Amino acid sequence: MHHHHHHAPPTLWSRVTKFGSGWGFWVSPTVFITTTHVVPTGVKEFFGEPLSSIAIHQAGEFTQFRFSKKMRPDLTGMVLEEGCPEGTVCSVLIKRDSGELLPLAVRMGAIASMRIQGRLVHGQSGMLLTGANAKGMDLGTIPGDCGAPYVHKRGNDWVVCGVHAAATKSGNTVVCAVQAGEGETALE
């Protein structure tokens, strides 16, 4: 009784932050995420945090933002899911200027190691499940909404998948930029 379709977490929507030519997410008080193609060239600080006191770590369209200080504007600590099983419905957070939030949805596929620029990277595909917002280099972007963060309900909370990397030739299929860490060395 009353289960399908429910209210979305507010703080979860505020986590997203349109930077440069894309959108990121607040991994934690002093932690953040962002894509590579989204990163612009002109700014030297984020939310009042000079790069001089920041750390960057690329990894297949996955940059690790480590701030020297914990801004903690309205966060606490989110969970990162390195991919997803077969049948995982993820949702992106597309915020606009006039508050036109565009909540997109995508169905996760299988986990495999793709090859980009002669580099093996681990990422989970994702078939579109909305209409046809995909253009070819993203699930649904127009004014520069690339790299958007993915979210999903996990137990009694919402875990983040990756970021809007790009779309496939099929159009209704994008790749969720996953992070590198545990799970690859573990056996189970």
UniProtKB/Swiss-Prot annotation:
The active site is at residues 37, 61, 146. Residues 8-188 form the Peptidase C37 domain. It catalyses: Endopeptidase with a preference for cleavage when the P1 position is occupied by Glu-|-Xaa and the P1' position is occupied by Gly-|-Yaa. Inhibited by the chemical compound K36/GC376, which covalently binds to the nucleophilic cysteine residue. Inhibited by various macrocyclic inhibitors. Processes the polyprotein. 3CLpro-RdRp is first released by autocleavage, then all other proteins are cleaved. May cleave host polyadenylate-binding protein thereby inhibiting cellular translation. Homodimer. Monomer; in solution. This is 3C-like protease. It comes from Norovirus (strain Human/NoV/United States/Norwalk/1968/GI).
